[PDB]
Symmetry: C3
Subunit: 275 residues, 3 copies
């Protein structure tokens, strides 16, 4: 089996996410036409690129934006929070107002980054390099939604926060994780009501997105991570439940589907940085 | 000429020096070994430092700061030491638990969100023996600093000032030789010292809530190795006590340098970097 | 030609900046008398030093403090904020008060750093290494001031924020940047009034310094970067316009003039970490 191109490594991820084009938080920094053995990690910086070269890897795949147009255009993906809220019955105006804080600060952080820092190291090393973020989190989102829905839907109004956690614990990524699923707002024994799986929108929606879901009929919100001071502000105010599943464990759901699709295409994947 | 040390032996030297009976949760062996003769030790060790250790031909790496794995995961279990330290200076066990509750809740949330296997995955791919020793060495440094201050300020009684504690600490080579200086961000050097609590070896500094628990239960002077600048400003605005901030690296070196000398006596060569 | 010493690499920067002593945010970590091929980047840590060795570079130059006396003594350059405020008509006592919190917080952060971390790696690698920060930022500050003033002085009271931005967009660093110039406080259609280009004072002045300019006859303040929460706190109070030019594009104004002078002396500069 011939090695894959970076264009093919992107296509495999878009096919499974059902996306027609690479989203703004993902980029090819260094192209290649023949990758047989790649190193894949969630967080890749210059030290990990030097590591891949010492291991003799053909190229590197990262999950998190590593710079370039992925770090620069990252705030373009945030509008996906609006789609998820509207999907769950939050009014479009309420949903758009809720992300305005996160968007304003994400644009300022994007302008401030040293975008060419990790790509310049990849170019100097001649190391094929790309990050795939939103397509893999979208895959993860879909699995997590289907897993919870199939378990909580026959329960109806009897479903509790514990039942969505039990459903997520049927996934090997959560079952085998070193981390635990937490409930920083609300409790395990509280009614579930409607659940919103908020993942695959770039970053968690923090306080303001969870508040807008709680105020518009969605009692339980699920994030993969939350800022501690944002968890505390929501917890003291109450009005709903927050499930926080765990950054790495949650990312590995869509990432493991991808690694499997690469291996079937005959690419060897060297797992590291959380894989 | 002596045989190399195992990673188990490096842990046991630190626990014995610290007078501990169990390995604290903020210290872990990521990649084991039975024979280490030349090691690189640094306060902060990440993937770049492991790559360096391979370039230098080092047998193993000793970090001070948690580098992931169970050290980063279970770091919040060490924070209960802040309770025991507060209780020793007269804070009731419930008021001490109340004061650490916020740092404990946020630390649990921070421990869950880390990429625990990042630096350990690098050490395994490099097949580089690697471990971190945090709380045991901080506990060694805490006792040295308590004894130095107490031996200097106790004969002084009520005449002892904040300055007398600082002069005592300046007789330690880590502080006498430090590039940084000991600071007093709350209170002043000319204030009465009263009772002092050395709040080192409990994982991280206590911040605002812990310093306030000590100030409210008859401990006029609190000592940290570091403080968040916003936590210092909140304490300074309220007043009613002195805070001594000794300097992160220089304070970590008090316990670390005793450990390094014990390894060198067991014939282990230590390559010093990242603050050592 | 012939290779340059670390002392001559520093002198070229101080001559350009029209300075007579070395700013405390700039230091030579590992000396040398003969550097013919150097690597230069805005951010240089241990991984970048390992890269320089793989590429066979003679030395490394950083922009940002990389430890040692540069990180330790960085707060000393913040007095430059007071000199710029006083030069734009801000009363000396108000200028001194405006920088007090940033100074107090910078002294605490300086005491907390692992100063010998990156310098210890440079020494173990025997890699000549230095950082040049304030001198290059001062060259960039002067170029930006001259560019803006030439464009807006003929407009007088009719000059707008847009006119200062249009002037900056004649510089190749801003015209070619991946980032855009932003106006987080006020707007491009607002009167410019007096402008203060606040660059070359170590770091931006945040809320407290921009408030002091606004309250003392300087309607427009320019920073290369601002903390997002600081921009939001300034925006809620209004008072004037804030132009935020972009960290890397602005740092490159002084850095490109410096590189040009090294190349004229025959030194090869390997650009990376933003250059
Ligand atoms: Cl997140
Ligand atoms: Cl600390
Ligand atoms: Cl800045």
């Amino acid at each position: 089996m011939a090695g894959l191109s970076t264009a093919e490594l992107v296509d495999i991820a878009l096919e499974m996410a059902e996306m027609r084009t690479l989203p703004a938080d993902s980029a090819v920094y260094v192209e290649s036409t023949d990758l047989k053995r790649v190193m894949m990690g969630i967080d890749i910086g210059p030290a990990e690129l030097l590591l891949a070269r010492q291991l003799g890897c053909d190229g590197v795949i990262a999950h998190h934006p590593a710079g370039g147009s992925a770090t620069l255009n990252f705030p373009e993906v945030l509008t996906r929070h609006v789609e998820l809220m509207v999907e769950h019955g939050v009014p479009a105006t309420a949903a758009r107002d809720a992300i305005q804080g996160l968007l304003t600060r994400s644009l300022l952080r994007a302008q401030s980054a040293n975008h060419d820092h990790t790509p310049s190291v990849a170019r100097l090393l001649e190391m094929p390099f790309l990050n795939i973020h939103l397509p893999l989190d979208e895959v993860g989102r879909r699995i997590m939604v289907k897993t919870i829905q199939e378990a909580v839907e026959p329960l109806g109004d009897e479903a509790r926060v514990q039942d969505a956690i039990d459903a997520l614990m049927t996934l090997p990524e959560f079952a085998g994780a070193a981390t635990r699923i937490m409930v920083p707002v609300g409790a395990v024994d509280q009614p579930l009501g409607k659940i919103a799986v908020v993942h695959g929108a770039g970053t968690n929606g923090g306080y303001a997105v969870a508040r807008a879901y709680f105020d518009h009929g969605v009692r339980t919100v699920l994030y993969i991570h939350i800022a501690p001071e944002e968890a505390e502000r929501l917890r003291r105010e109450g009005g709903g439940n927050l499930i926080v599943t765990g950054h790495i464990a949650s990312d590995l759901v869509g990432i493991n589907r991808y690694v499997q699709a690469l291996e079937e295409r005959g690419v060897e994947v060297v797992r590291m940085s959380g894989l």
